[PDB]
Each structure stands twice: as structure tokens, then as C-alpha cells.
Amino acid sequence: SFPKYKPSRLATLPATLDPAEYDISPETRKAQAERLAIRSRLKREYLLQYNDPNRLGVIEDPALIRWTYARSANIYPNFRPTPKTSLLGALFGIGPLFFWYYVFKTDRDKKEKLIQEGKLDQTFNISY
């Protein structure tokens, strides 16, 4: 029939094309009800605080606090030296340094060799 649409990571799958959207178990409905209940509880709490007339300040968000804490302060305590982490760190932290060192060293060696051989155009090169 019609050509199929292939989802990607940067072009996800639409809801209307999801196969699971048309196979709804009775347990799926109760899961959706529980999710809606959680959202409603959080919304009610936030709306009570938000419509409080005597509140002056910022409604602290534990979710935001958890996100900012897990992004910064919770990383090292849960870091373990594994082969994957070791190889990735070694590569991403050392390889670029040696690559750029080799590039600049080769370029400067060629330039200095040209200088010594006296066949590099250095006329008008006054500022350095």
C-alpha cells in the first residue's frame, strides 16, 4: 500500500502510527487512569499553593531540585571505573590533545625547515 514511515531518533514515531495505540488492554486503561491521578494530585497541590493569597515567594519545585542535583552533584558518587568509562575518558580527553599536538608540530616543523632552507615568502611580515 502506501510507503511506510521509518521513525528515527531525531524524527520520532507519531502517536497515530504507533501500533500499541490500537491494542489497548484493560490494564493499559488502568495504567492511564493511574497516570492521570498522579498528574491531578500534583496539579492540585501546585494550584493550591499558586492561588494561596498569603503566599509571597517561589513555589519550590522538588523535581527541578532533583534535576539540578542529579546533573551536577550526583554524578561522581555513582561513577565507577569500568572498561567503557575508562576507554571513553581516555579517548575523549587524551586523543584530541595528541592529535592537535601532532598537527601543530608538523606544521611548525615544515615552516622552520622552509625558514632554514630560505625559500619561505616572509617579505612585509613585520608584525608578529
Partner: protein, 174 residues
């Protein structure tokens, strides 16, 4: 103008063609120039006349400082700190003067390019050669001394250059 030296800053004689109109139409450029002279040039000239009259009543003078020559780092003994200080200061002053000489030559080059306009590649060949020679000498003098340059380092560079020239001359004569 006597403000600057015509020999240090040469200007070719200015050849302006005379107007040779071929139409009876009036010249808007001429009319607007007359308006500009009537409305702007005369008021600014009167204002400057008043200002210069005020300046002439309080005439006073300033002078150009003269420095006598002092022994250089070649004459200075080793670790003779006072002679080294005097020689280094003199070398720095000479370095500044040479930089300004190069600046003067570059100003000549730019002015000649702009003046000659569409025929600059041919008519500015004289100012290009002077700039080439001046820049060559300046580069040979102070090319790659570094951030912590000094008269001692410049003397070492000159000694290296002299040794290279002597070796080249000996090899050529061999």
C-alpha cells in the same frame, strides 16, 4: 601648508582641468557649491578668524627634546649594569624612531595608491620599492626578537647575521 614638511610627505603637483561645458543647462554642482560656500565656509572662516585672534594674544611655545648619544651595548662591559641600562634605553628609543620611520613610508604608500587611483600599479612603483627596502631593513633588524627583546638579543642576532655573511663570502671566494 607649513604644518608638515613637504619633503618628508611629498605631494605630486595637482593638475586640475578647467571647465569646458558643452550644454546650456546650469550646473547643480556649481549652484550647490556656491550655496555651501555662502552658508558654511564663510561662518566657519569667521569663527576660525576669531579663534586665531584669541590664540595670537597668548602666544607660547613648546620644544622638542634632544637626547645626546651614549655608549651602546657593544661598548658596555659585561654585567656593567649602568652602561647596560643607558644602552638599553637608547636602543629602545632608536627602535621607536625606526618604527615611526616605517609608519611614514607606509603613509606615503597608502597616499600614493589613493591618489593615483586607477593607475596605481604603475605610478606607485617608486613608493613600493622604498617600502620594500625599508621593511627589509627593519625586519632584518627587529624581526624575531620576542616579547622580552633587548639590545643584547639584537646584538646577538646581528652577530649571527655577520657570521653567516662572512661564511657565505668565504665559501664564494673558495
Amino acid at each position: 601648508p607649513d604644518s608638515w614638511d613637504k619633503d618628508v610627505y611629498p605631494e605630486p603637483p595637482r593638475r586640475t582641468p578647467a571647465p569646458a561645458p558643452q550644454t546650456s543647462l546650469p550646473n547643480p554642482v556649481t549652484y550647490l557649491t556656491k550655496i555651501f560656500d555662502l552658508l558654511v565656509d564663510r561662518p566657519v572662516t569667521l569663527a576660525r578668524e576669531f579663534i586665531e585672534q584669541q590664540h595670537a594674544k597668548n602666544r607660547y611655545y613648546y620644544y622638542h627634546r634632544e637626547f645626546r648619544r651614549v655608549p651602546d651595548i657593544t661598548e658596555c662591559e659585561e654585567k656593567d649594569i649602568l652602561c647596560m641600562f643607558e644602552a638599553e634605553m637608547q636602543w629602545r628609543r632608536d627602535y621607536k624612531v625606526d618604527q615611526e620611520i616605517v609608519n611614514i613610508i607606509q603613509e606615503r604608500l597608502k597616499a600614493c595608491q589613493q591618489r593615483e587611483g586607477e593607475s596605481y600599479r604603475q605610478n606607485c612603483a617608486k613608493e613600493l620599492e622604498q617600502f620594500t627596502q625599508v621593511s627589509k631593513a627593519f625586519q632584518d633588524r627587529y624581526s624575531d626578537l620576542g616579547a622580552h627583546y633587548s639590545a643584547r638579543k639584537c646584538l646577538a642576532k646581528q652577530k649571527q647575521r655577520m657570521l653567516a655573511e662572512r661564511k657565505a663570502a668565504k665559501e664564494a671566494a673558495a
